[PDB]
């Protein structure tokens, strides 16, 4: 099936645009983890590296470009434009303890030992744990003034449609990617803790 992967990707893009648009119009990035956004920018950079090499479609190059431009712009707004509202004192997760184990795991556990496959496995593993700095920040302060309800919905719709995609392709096509699925389950459980913390701590 390709209806679920398409609407899932579009729902992920919607979340990125919503967060980016929220920061610009409120002139604040209060409650946002710049470390998580940096990791997500690193996911898209490593996954879509063949931007600047193979051309397949105008939707293909632009979608790769849209994700990159939006993630980098969010990073630019948090650490440069609106750095005064960046709660650096609360975003303290040491991301080297994510990237280094993720890098080592990608060289150890993958489907094929090749540069393009290792790079893809890196971006799959990293994305599954990229939200961790955001979780520890909300768990720390109980606030996420910039996180909107609709932002979390599109993040959740992205995970639900991908879950459906795994099930449809397995039952109807016999396809299953154990690495992508296992990493995808870790990511979805982590997003659910994101949603559980937001409801219990921020939504007081």
């Amino acid at each position: 099936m390709n209806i679920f992967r398409l609407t899932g990707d579009l729902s992920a893009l919607a979340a990125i645009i919503i967060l980016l648009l929220k920061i610009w119009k409120s002139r604040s990035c209060a409650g946002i983890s710049g470390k998580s956004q940096l990791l997500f920018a690193l996911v898209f950079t490593t996954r879509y590296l063949d931007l600047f090499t193979s051309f397949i479609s105008l939707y293909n190059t632009s979608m790769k470009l849209i994700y990159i431009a939006c993630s980098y712009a969010t990073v630019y707004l948090i650490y440069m434009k609106f750095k005064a509202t960046y709660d650096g004192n609360h975003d303290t997760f040491r991301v080297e303890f994510l990237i280094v184990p993720v890098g080592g795991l990608s060289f150890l556990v993958n489907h094929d030992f090749s540069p393009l496959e290792i790079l893809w496995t890196f971006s799959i593993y990293l994305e599954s744990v990229a939200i961790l700095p955001q979780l520890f920040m909300i768990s720390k302060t109980g606030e996420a003034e910039t996180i909107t309800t609709h932002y979390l919905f599109f993040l959740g719709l992205y995970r639900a449609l991908y879950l459906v995609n795994w099930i449809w392709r397995y039952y109807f096509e016999g396809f299953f990617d154990l690495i992508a699925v296992v990493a995808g389950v870790v990511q979805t459980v982590l997003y659910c803790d994101f949603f559980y913390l937001y409801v219990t701590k921020v939504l007081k």
Epitope: N2, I56, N60, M63, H111, S114, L116, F175
Partner: nanobody, 121 residues
Framework: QVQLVESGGGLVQAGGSLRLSCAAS????????MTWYRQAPGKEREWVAA????????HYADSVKGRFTISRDNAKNTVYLQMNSLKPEDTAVYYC??????????????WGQGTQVTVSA
């Protein structure tokens, strides 16, 4: 943009073996998957065996485990389906389907014309 051609079908006795081939032509992508389907007369098409562009991963339907073997050959743009110990229930038109596994490649989805496989009891 991409053409798939299946061959190797025909008539064979029960307990025989056959090897189908799906030759791919056109513009390649870095990461793909290839799946064999078959459609017996009057029934729905069902997937049979699956393989990726690299790695040791293979998958076989419950009804063909131990009897079918799927294998690759990128130097020729061809994927094989080895069929041993054939039963009359394997009679169908077999199709191969190649999909792009890269991101944002939703419409890169190609099917062969089909090759007839008949197994006499």
């Amino acid at each position: 943009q991409v053409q798939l051609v299946e061959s190797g079908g025909g008539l064979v006795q029960a307990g025989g073996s056959l090897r189908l081939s799906c030759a791919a032509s056109g513009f390649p992508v870095k990461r793909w998957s290839m799946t064999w389907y078959r459609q017996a007369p009057g029934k729905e098409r069902e997937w049979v065996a699956a393989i990726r562009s690299a790695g040791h991963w293979t998958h076989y339907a419950d009804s063909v485990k131990g009897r079918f073997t799927i294998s690759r050959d990128n130097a020729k743009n061809t994927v094989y389906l080895q069929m041993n110990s054939l039963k009359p229930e394997d009679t169908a038109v077999y199709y191969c389907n190649v999909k792009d596994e890269g991101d944002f490649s939703y419409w890169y989805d190609y099917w062969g014309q089909g090759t007839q496989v008949t197994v006499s009891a």
